[PDB]
């Protein structure tokens, strides 16, 4: 078997070339993207086999640097994230190849052999092994939004495992890879629009936990900014590094993204006070129903759909609606009108019975049935209007005046109807409790027209006792009327 | 052949030095160029190479998981560094002089034949017993007390870098309230403590100190932050773990947070006011309120309890607080009486719970707030029987207009003296123990004392009031329900005890007087204060 019998120093220059990132070498001739040592290489010493052993280890390192060079090649020859990743990866080799070319200088111009260049390259062959595992998760994968999210999330996970020179590498490799997101996030905030390419961002107008703990403050600031125009963040994170790594350290980035948010949401609410006002639009809504409406209903006591309109502009129907502009349309939604209409219908029936039994002025036996009834309806009316329709109303106004958000203003509002529809018993338990109050209201209609008498108290004393013996189950706020 | 060997000792086996997966590095067979004797010294030398290969293979494999295993291998390369370096030099000398022989290799590597075979078993114990977590910081320490100086100077380095992990986590927790861990390595896992993983040389005393200084931050949600970071970092530079110094940095941190916590626990959050609320209602401090509540909510509790009585009393208690001309919408809805129903007289299940606020949530746990309830159950009973008993007296004098009816007061007064003065030693164990609890507060600036002074104050009440002492508590209990029968007997009628009442009257005196003297033998530590009052006129002395 013939062999080439290469000299000694030649091998080192080969390895320096291979680790540099070139191809077509007399040694380490790759075949299928996998570098492999030749078979006829031999030195005067090392019995032709140890050489195949020592080269095999360096060959394993060539694979790590050849595959990466193939990756950078397939990017040069608008993803805007891999470009930010390769530029970080490529930036490492330049600071690394200088350490290689420098060694070759001391070869042409001190003795140097194999066992010396390897030990001299220990803090490099260590840092290189990490990349073979970090990049292995960025090559094993089809959509552009899953290939970039899964990559950027692998870094933030791989650093927390390493929490020193290896951490300085991954960190400097991280910042240059999150630069695209940190740009569009800032750009979306101040410029009020999301400028994405190939739907790279996760919000396609499956999530990286990097920015999750503050994500809610982003979207609620982005969309809020877009509704304002119709009426350098990365250069901040880096200076923070100048003045406990990436977990508490990252917890100091958000003050840059949170105070910026606080101005935006505080700006929309500020301009919403006048100029598409809301506080005067909201109060008048709950004012034109729930005086003015006194004369309106009295005309209905003594029909036509146009007759009421001229009256308003001056058994269970009368659907009322309102006109809402666009800046407030999102607050007072369409399904919000019905709830406001719901409580308006029921409220009038109480005003009806209360006014029907009050407008007028065994013969006198009817009066003992008047006070026994006029008081009861008067008691219920004092419960709905005063201790419900004015308690939550007094609290609601004290809450809206501290609105600091587009979203929470909907919640504080939606937490006003869905509770006022519960205290006023209209949602559930209707055929169990509410019907009792409904059927006794028919006594306010029958007794009003007639102006049989003994057969009313037998019914009245029954249904009223039926009312208390049913409501006795008391959920807790019902006791404010249970006294009578 | 020399450069051939110096690679075999590096981790690269060849034709001359074959490699076997079980035995290790060894020479193949005889060779003409080598002397037939030198094959032995090589085989003795290869005992050094087999270690380094099995070392670096384990180091790369990283195998089990955990930071304390990652750091061990990270440090294991540091002690191995002089071996690599001292091998590079052998190339230098041999390159110069062409006459050296293998015997010179044996002289240079003498110490390494002594360092590896001992540190090897340290690795073998790990891979053979699944030593996971902080238990490594003891397994390596139990072998650090060896006799060989180099071995002692080697493992101490590994322990010096392995402590860097704990020192990283320890400082991250004692000042940021969170523990950076995802594999349950730290000895902390409402948090708790771990003992089956806690180090050996670390005492439990400081372990308790750590568990408190951290939870006091996580619950709590300047210059006292950075300076301690420099202290913790300083210990990481120490090449020898000195427990005598580990405590001087922990205790100062402990005293500072405790001093800071005491400031809030008393000054900003008024504990004295809250304790004043507890003494009044739990311990019947405001007895004038409970006599009216008992006066009203009486008939609705002698009947067995049902699902409705729970609300039938909360309104009565509310009717009571206004009936004593006390008006305060604060702390009035915070008191909610409970009825232990469905898991029997109604009084036996009565109780009072307290929805504590946020700051005192740490001082008043459901445990300590439960022992308070037991005192309220018992102290109310004595109050119930006393108020009931005196009403009978309020009727005897009211019954002034039988030679046997006079036996009533001759028993009533006896039942009175034993019971009325029994409510004494109560106003003199409450107003004495409480007066110490309030004094231990305004004395020590530390907060740790309060958690112990208050805890000891509570244990005394259970001990002083004979609640825990079973024999006396099971004899006086018979005296309690005894008066219920007697007082009822006088109230269930308005005439002389003739219709089998006298026949029932003489029943209890045969038991009461027996129960009376039975207690007397029990008393004959703390009973001296009680027995002195009953024995002032020496009536029991003649008994």
mmCIF file of N, CA and C in Angstrom, chain B residues 385-397 404-421 479 482-491 505 508-509 512-513 539-540:
data_model
loop_
_atom_site.group_PDB
_atom_site.id
_atom_site.type_symbol
_atom_site.label_atom_id
_atom_site.label_comp_id
_atom_site.label_asym_id
_atom_site.label_seq_id
_atom_site.Cartn_x
_atom_site.Cartn_y
_atom_site.Cartn_z
ATOM 1 N N UNK B 385 -72.498 29.955 81.737
ATOM 2 C CA UNK B 385 -72.985 29.351 82.972
ATOM 3 C C UNK B 385 -72.986 30.367 84.107
ATOM 4 N N UNK B 386 -72.037 31.305 84.107
ATOM 5 C CA UNK B 386 -72.003 32.311 85.161
ATOM 6 C C UNK B 386 -73.181 33.266 85.043
ATOM 7 N N UNK B 387 -73.418 33.793 83.840
ATOM 8 C CA UNK B 387 -74.562 34.675 83.639
ATOM 9 C C UNK B 387 -75.867 33.947 83.931
ATOM 10 N N UNK B 388 -75.940 32.665 83.574
ATOM 11 C CA UNK B 388 -77.132 31.881 83.868
ATOM 12 C C UNK B 388 -77.297 31.680 85.369
ATOM 13 N N UNK B 389 -76.204 31.356 86.059
ATOM 14 C CA UNK B 389 -76.284 31.054 87.483
ATOM 15 C C UNK B 389 -76.764 32.257 88.283
ATOM 16 N N UNK B 390 -76.224 33.441 87.992
ATOM 17 C CA UNK B 390 -76.576 34.617 88.779
ATOM 18 C C UNK B 390 -78.019 35.039 88.555
ATOM 19 N N UNK B 391 -78.587 34.731 87.386
ATOM 20 C CA UNK B 391 -79.995 35.038 87.164
ATOM 21 C C UNK B 391 -80.876 34.285 88.149
ATOM 22 N N UNK B 392 -80.500 33.051 88.482
ATOM 23 C CA UNK B 392 -81.219 32.313 89.513
ATOM 24 C C UNK B 392 -81.153 33.049 90.844
ATOM 25 N N UNK B 393 -79.965 33.538 91.207
ATOM 26 C CA UNK B 393 -79.850 34.362 92.404
ATOM 27 C C UNK B 393 -80.725 35.599 92.293
ATOM 28 N N UNK B 394 -80.799 36.187 91.099
ATOM 29 C CA UNK B 394 -81.674 37.331 90.886
ATOM 30 C C UNK B 394 -83.142 36.982 91.073
ATOM 31 N N UNK B 395 -83.479 35.695 91.137
ATOM 32 C CA UNK B 395 -84.845 35.248 91.368
ATOM 33 C C UNK B 395 -85.092 34.835 92.811
ATOM 34 N N UNK B 396 -84.106 34.212 93.460
ATOM 35 C CA UNK B 396 -84.264 33.831 94.860
ATOM 36 C C UNK B 396 -84.538 35.052 95.726
ATOM 37 N N UNK B 397 -83.690 36.076 95.615
ATOM 38 C CA UNK B 397 -83.952 37.319 96.329
ATOM 39 C C UNK B 397 -85.253 37.953 95.856
ATOM 40 N N UNK B 404 -86.965 22.630 103.637
ATOM 41 C CA UNK B 404 -86.079 21.978 102.685
ATOM 42 C C UNK B 404 -85.728 22.855 101.494
ATOM 43 N N UNK B 405 -86.565 23.843 101.167
ATOM 44 C CA UNK B 405 -86.261 24.728 100.047
ATOM 45 C C UNK B 405 -85.012 25.554 100.311
ATOM 46 N N UNK B 406 -84.675 25.781 101.584
ATOM 47 C CA UNK B 406 -83.470 26.528 101.923
ATOM 48 C C UNK B 406 -82.199 25.794 101.535
ATOM 49 N N UNK B 407 -82.294 24.505 101.205
ATOM 50 C CA UNK B 407 -81.136 23.780 100.700
ATOM 51 C C UNK B 407 -80.675 24.311 99.351
ATOM 52 N N UNK B 408 -81.519 25.074 98.656
ATOM 53 C CA UNK B 408 -81.137 25.626 97.360
ATOM 54 C C UNK B 408 -79.944 26.560 97.502
ATOM 55 N N UNK B 409 -80.115 27.642 98.264
ATOM 56 C CA UNK B 409 -79.039 28.614 98.423
ATOM 57 C C UNK B 409 -77.835 28.007 99.127
ATOM 58 N N UNK B 410 -78.058 27.031 100.008
ATOM 59 C CA UNK B 410 -76.939 26.311 100.603
ATOM 60 C C UNK B 410 -76.170 25.506 99.569
ATOM 61 N N UNK B 411 -76.772 25.229 98.415
ATOM 62 C CA UNK B 411 -76.044 24.662 97.290
ATOM 63 C C UNK B 411 -75.686 25.717 96.255
ATOM 64 N N UNK B 412 -76.559 26.708 96.058
ATOM 65 C CA UNK B 412 -76.296 27.751 95.074
ATOM 66 C C UNK B 412 -75.028 28.521 95.417
ATOM 67 N N UNK B 413 -74.888 28.926 96.682
ATOM 68 C CA UNK B 413 -73.703 29.674 97.088
ATOM 69 C C UNK B 413 -72.439 28.846 96.909
ATOM 70 N N UNK B 414 -72.495 27.559 97.254
ATOM 71 C CA UNK B 414 -71.352 26.686 97.015
ATOM 72 C C UNK B 414 -71.035 26.610 95.529
ATOM 73 N N UNK B 415 -72.065 26.445 94.697
ATOM 74 C CA UNK B 415 -71.850 26.458 93.256
ATOM 75 C C UNK B 415 -71.437 27.840 92.767
ATOM 76 N N UNK B 416 -71.749 28.885 93.534
ATOM 77 C CA UNK B 416 -71.362 30.237 93.149
ATOM 78 C C UNK B 416 -69.886 30.480 93.438
ATOM 79 N N UNK B 417 -69.457 30.207 94.672
ATOM 80 C CA UNK B 417 -68.080 30.491 95.061
ATOM 81 C C UNK B 417 -67.087 29.734 94.191
ATOM 82 N N UNK B 418 -67.406 28.487 93.840
ATOM 83 C CA UNK B 418 -66.497 27.719 92.997
ATOM 84 C C UNK B 418 -66.457 28.299 91.593
ATOM 85 N N UNK B 419 -67.560 28.881 91.132
ATOM 86 C CA UNK B 419 -67.641 29.346 89.755
ATOM 87 C C UNK B 419 -67.239 30.805 89.602
ATOM 88 N N UNK B 420 -67.674 31.673 90.515
ATOM 89 C CA UNK B 420 -67.349 33.089 90.387
ATOM 90 C C UNK B 420 -65.846 33.309 90.487
ATOM 91 N N UNK B 421 -65.223 32.785 91.543
ATOM 92 C CA UNK B 421 -63.774 32.873 91.649
ATOM 93 C C UNK B 421 -63.062 32.044 90.589
ATOM 94 N N UNK B 479 -68.690 19.999 86.268
ATOM 95 C CA UNK B 479 -69.286 21.070 87.058
ATOM 96 C C UNK B 479 -70.041 22.038 86.160
ATOM 97 N N UNK B 482 -73.373 20.764 85.157
ATOM 98 C CA UNK B 482 -74.098 20.500 86.395
ATOM 99 C C UNK B 482 -74.984 21.679 86.769
ATOM 100 N N UNK B 483 -74.450 22.897 86.670
ATOM 101 C CA UNK B 483 -75.233 24.074 87.025
ATOM 102 C C UNK B 483 -76.393 24.289 86.064
ATOM 103 N N UNK B 484 -76.236 23.883 84.801
ATOM 104 C CA UNK B 484 -77.346 23.951 83.855
ATOM 105 C C UNK B 484 -78.562 23.208 84.387
ATOM 106 N N UNK B 485 -78.345 22.020 84.950
ATOM 107 C CA UNK B 485 -79.449 21.246 85.506
ATOM 108 C C UNK B 485 -80.045 21.941 86.723
ATOM 109 N N UNK B 486 -79.190 22.412 87.633
ATOM 110 C CA UNK B 486 -79.683 23.034 88.856
ATOM 111 C C UNK B 486 -80.428 24.326 88.555
ATOM 112 N N UNK B 487 -79.823 25.202 87.752
ATOM 113 C CA UNK B 487 -80.459 26.479 87.442
ATOM 114 C C UNK B 487 -81.791 26.273 86.735
ATOM 115 N N UNK B 488 -81.860 25.288 85.840
ATOM 116 C CA UNK B 488 -83.127 24.981 85.189
ATOM 117 C C UNK B 488 -84.163 24.522 86.205
ATOM 118 N N UNK B 489 -83.747 23.690 87.162
ATOM 119 C CA UNK B 489 -84.674 23.171 88.163
ATOM 120 C C UNK B 489 -85.355 24.297 88.928
ATOM 121 N N UNK B 490 -84.614 25.358 89.244
ATOM 122 C CA UNK B 490 -85.210 26.472 89.971
ATOM 123 C C UNK B 490 -86.090 27.315 89.056
ATOM 124 N N UNK B 491 -85.757 27.392 87.770
ATOM 125 C CA UNK B 491 -86.522 28.215 86.842
ATOM 126 C C UNK B 491 -87.707 27.477 86.234
ATOM 127 N N UNK B 505 -83.130 16.855 93.486
ATOM 128 C CA UNK B 505 -82.167 17.794 94.050
ATOM 129 C C UNK B 505 -81.051 17.064 94.786
ATOM 130 N N UNK B 508 -77.739 15.510 92.762
ATOM 131 C CA UNK B 508 -76.530 16.202 92.332
ATOM 132 C C UNK B 508 -75.585 16.459 93.498
ATOM 133 N N UNK B 509 -76.129 16.780 94.675
ATOM 134 C CA UNK B 509 -75.277 17.077 95.824
ATOM 135 C C UNK B 509 -74.426 15.870 96.192
ATOM 136 N N UNK B 512 -72.030 16.381 93.196
ATOM 137 C CA UNK B 512 -71.320 17.655 93.224
ATOM 138 C C UNK B 512 -70.302 17.698 94.354
ATOM 139 N N UNK B 513 -70.753 17.481 95.593
ATOM 140 C CA UNK B 513 -69.829 17.479 96.721
ATOM 141 C C UNK B 513 -68.748 16.424 96.534
ATOM 142 N N UNK B 539 -62.906 26.587 103.790
ATOM 143 C CA UNK B 539 -64.082 25.726 103.753
ATOM 144 C C UNK B 539 -63.724 24.331 103.258
ATOM 145 N N UNK B 540 -62.863 24.239 102.242
ATOM 146 C CA UNK B 540 -62.441 22.926 101.762
ATOM 147 C C UNK B 540 -61.551 22.218 102.773
#
